[PDB]
Every structure is written in structure tokens, then in C-alpha cells.
């Protein structure tokens, strides 16, 4: 069925800096890569070991969707050498990898910016995944329609030719 | 410090008295708008004891 074809719903890149100058400068790196403004996520607790105080923005994230997602996912996967661990596939079907630095994407390093890693998470969807998102008649996606971890590896090997 | 022995006997000696009949049809606590209309309707009918 053409209605059972997997796709990339979204790519969420998180830079968990854990300094505000640093946080904002990582927002700029996310902004340049995705072209959409990132949102900041606040601390949910105070931990002295991690040097974190509650109520302080600790991380930045941008939800990149569409062909821009496919482009960034490909650039990031190439940094990994198109090698993705076999475990990183979740029981829900989604998978993710983390890169260190931003120059490996190809964004030129500028002394104006700093050097920082991105945690790339990729969510996979099938046509019909809006039934658990609609305000009216929100219903859970049927188990058959739902993507399986193995059937997600199959889709990603075909698409970016990644090897486990 | 407290007793209820003989309270009930006393209550039913000549008691459990019903609450009159006036209270049943009283207009205290009824809606002002209902009451004003009831006065208007009886007043404009030939039933009304108007001069």
C-alpha cells in the first residue's frame, strides 16, 4: 500500500550546553544549520555536581522537518561515516545519533562562535500518524500501522545506505 | 459533661409538632420576579380586590 511508506517526520537537534554566552552561540549554530530559530529549554531541577541551577535555560533545540530534515540527517550520518549502532533503533521505530563539533557538518568554524556537539534524533512516520495528533477523534495508531524497530532499520539502510 | 438521656422522652411528650400551614405557602425566599408577576396578574384580573 502506498499508505504504508515510512518517511522522516522530524529531526530534533539538542545542544545541552549545561554558560549563557555559550547557550546563545549554540543557538546561532543551530540557526545557521536549520534556518529556523531554535527554542531554549529550562532546567527542571538544581544539581550542584552538574553545575546547574533550576529555572536556567540549559539546552537549545530546533525541530527541523521536510527535505531540510533529510539534508541535515544525511550530512550528519556522513560524519558518523554512515555507520549507525544497531541498538540506536528504538522499540517505537525512531533512531538517533550524536555528533561532536559543527564543522563536521560543514558549517565553517568561526572564532566568533565556539565548538559544540549536536544530539541528532530522527522520528520516523507513516501516512496516517496524525490520528494520535488531531484535536478531534485523537485515536492511537493501529499496531500494524505502527513502525517496528527492525522495519525502521530496513527503511534507513535502503535510504541513506547506513550500515549497522 | 453531657447527656442525652431523657432528651428524646421530653421531645415526644406532647411533641413532634407539625410546622403550621402558613410556612408551607410563605413567599419568603421566593424569586422577586415571580412575586412581582404574581402581584401583577392577580391585580389586573377581575379576581383582584382593587378599589
Amino acid at each position: 500500500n502506498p499508505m504504508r511508506r515510512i518517511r522522516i517526520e522530524k529531526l530534533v537537534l539538542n545542544i545541552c550546553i549545561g554558560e549563557g554566552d555559550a547557550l546563545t552561540k549554540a543557538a546561532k549554530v543551530l540557526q545557521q544549520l536549520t534556518d529556523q530559530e531554535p527554542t531554549f529549554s529550562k532546567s527542571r531541577l538544581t544539581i550542584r555536581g552538574f553545575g546547574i541551577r533550576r529555572g536556567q535555560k540549559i539546552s537549545t533545540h530546533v525541530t527541523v522537518r521536510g527535505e531540510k530534515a533529510r539534508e541535515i540527517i544525511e550530512r550528519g550520518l556522513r560524519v558518523k561515516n554512515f555507520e549507525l549502532p544497531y541498538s540506536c533503533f528504538s522499540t517505537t521505530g525512531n533512531f538517533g545519533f550524536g555528533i561532536t563539533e559543527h564543522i563536521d557538518l560543514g558549517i565553517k568554524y568561526d572564532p566568533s562562535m565556539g565548538i559544540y556537539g549536536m544530539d541528532f534524533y530522527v522520528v520516523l512516520s507513516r501516512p496516517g500518524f496524525r490520528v494520535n495528533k488531531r484535536r478531534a477523534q485523537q485515536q492511537h495508531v493501529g499496531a500494524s500501522h505502527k513502525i517496528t524497530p527492525d522495519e525502521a532499520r530496513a527503511w534507513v539502510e535502503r535510504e541513506f545506505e547506513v550500515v549497522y | 459533661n453531657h447527656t442525652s438521656k431523657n432528651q428524646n422522652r421530653k421531645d415526644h411528650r406532647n411533641g413532634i409538632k407539625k410546622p403550621k400551614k402558613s410556612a408551607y405557602t410563605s413567599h419568603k425566599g421566593m424569586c422577586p420576579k415571580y412575586l412581582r408577576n404574581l402581584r401583577r396578574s392577580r391585580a389586573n384580573d377581575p379576581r383582584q380586590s382593587l378599589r
Binding site: 488531531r134 484535536r135 478531534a136 477523534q137 485523537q138 485515536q139 | 424569586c31 420576579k33 415571580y34
Partner: protein
Amino acid sequence: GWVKVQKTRSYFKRFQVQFRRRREGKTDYQARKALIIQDKNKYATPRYRFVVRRTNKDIICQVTAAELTKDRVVCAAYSHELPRYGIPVGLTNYAAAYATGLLCGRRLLEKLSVGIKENALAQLYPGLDKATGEEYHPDENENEEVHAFKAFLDIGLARASTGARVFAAMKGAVDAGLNIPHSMKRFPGYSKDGFDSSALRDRIMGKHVGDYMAELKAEDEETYRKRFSKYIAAKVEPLRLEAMYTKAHAAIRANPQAVKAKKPVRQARLTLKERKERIDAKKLE
């Protein structure tokens, strides 16, 4: 590894199912209660709701009195019926919604009027004949004696936004004389202290689609053929959309009365003995 089962016998024993129409996702009972509520001193006199529901292919405006065990739909007009009135395509667009609403108002007022068939009713409240969006409130402009039929909009789970199609139908029945309470702030043309009666009539007449259709044809004819295939097949020219809807608004006013225009197999459920054998077949292994 070994994890707890969140859905145990206990979870199921203590679970309270929500109301069917909430579980279905069809109804919000907070809104419903407030729309349905009448003061007790008004007794059983019916309170009427103007329910507007939008499907993938249709807009249905329904006037619905609430009863004790049922909801009575006094009159309903569906956008599927609008090609009888000359709108052959875009039957879910803003202009269609205004006309489906206009059909609802005219049909209801006329059904009530055929009850008087004499002095004052659907004639006492004629409705705006032209469709300028110009802040018409038929309820209290004049009234006296007979009063404008009053209904309250039930948008439903639809989000009330400036430019929503739910408002279009409401302006539409207000333009057929139904009194529906409004503010003209969620209808196109409103800013701060002023309301432009042209911008409301531009969407109500189809200008937004006409401009897109023409722009798509000029910039990329290939997209125009794919995006507006039915419109092109129905020979609907964009710079003629305003007259098509203007004559549909006239037609709906003239003849609101509505013409009244299988079974799947459902394999039979097994009787107990058949299941009592089916387990035995599985059991014999």
C-alpha cells in the same frame, strides 16, 4: 528486561470510561453544558444551537434544539447540496460556508413561516439580499412583537481564529435573519476600532481562490492543472467566481426548501457451540 505491566487487572477494574462522545472525540461537554444551559424559570422552552461541523468534503450547518434523551435538528443544510444553486466546486471553501449558512437561515425561517402562512415571520426578517459583510445584527436592530429566531454558535473542536470558516456560516445565517450573537472580530476585515466591509465580502465572494488560481496559472500552469483539476474540468473561470456565488446567494434565498434526493456482509458472529468447537480444534494440538 523484566518490567511491570502498567495495564494490570487492577488498572482495568478502577478505570472509568469517559462519556462515549468524549471517548469518540466528537464532543466537549464543558462547552455543550454552557450552550445547553437555560435558567430554570424558562422551563422547557427550547434553546436552539447553530451547530456548524466541517468534514473533509462537506460543511453541515444544523439548528439543533436539545431535548431530554435526544437532540432534535430543526433544519439542516449541507454544502453537498450547493451545486443545485450553481456552486459546482470548492464546496468546503469560505464562500461555500457562507452560502451553506445562508441556506440554513433561509430554510429555517421559511419552514417556520409555512407554519404562520399569513402575517409575519420569514418576511418580517427578510435578511440582507446582497452579501456585503457589513455588521448586520438582525436581533435588536428592530424586532418588536415577533422576534428573530435565536441560536448560539456551537463551533465544536474547531479553533475560533480570525478567518475561520465557522464564522463564515454564522455571518451567513445572520444574513438570512437568524439572530446569532457575534462581535465581528474573528471575521476578515477587523482591526482595533474599525471593520472593513469589503474584505469580509472578498472572501465571501471567492476572491482569495480567484487570485491564487490566476497566480498559479501564470507562474506555473502545471500546478494549476494539478491543484485545481475539478475547477478547470467544471469550466469555472476565476474572474467569474464572484458572479457565480452572487447568483447562488440569490438562488438559495429564492428556493430554500430542500428536495429529498446497501449493506456490507458483516460475517455472522459464531454461536457459543461454534466457539466451543473452535477452542477444541486449537486444544487438540
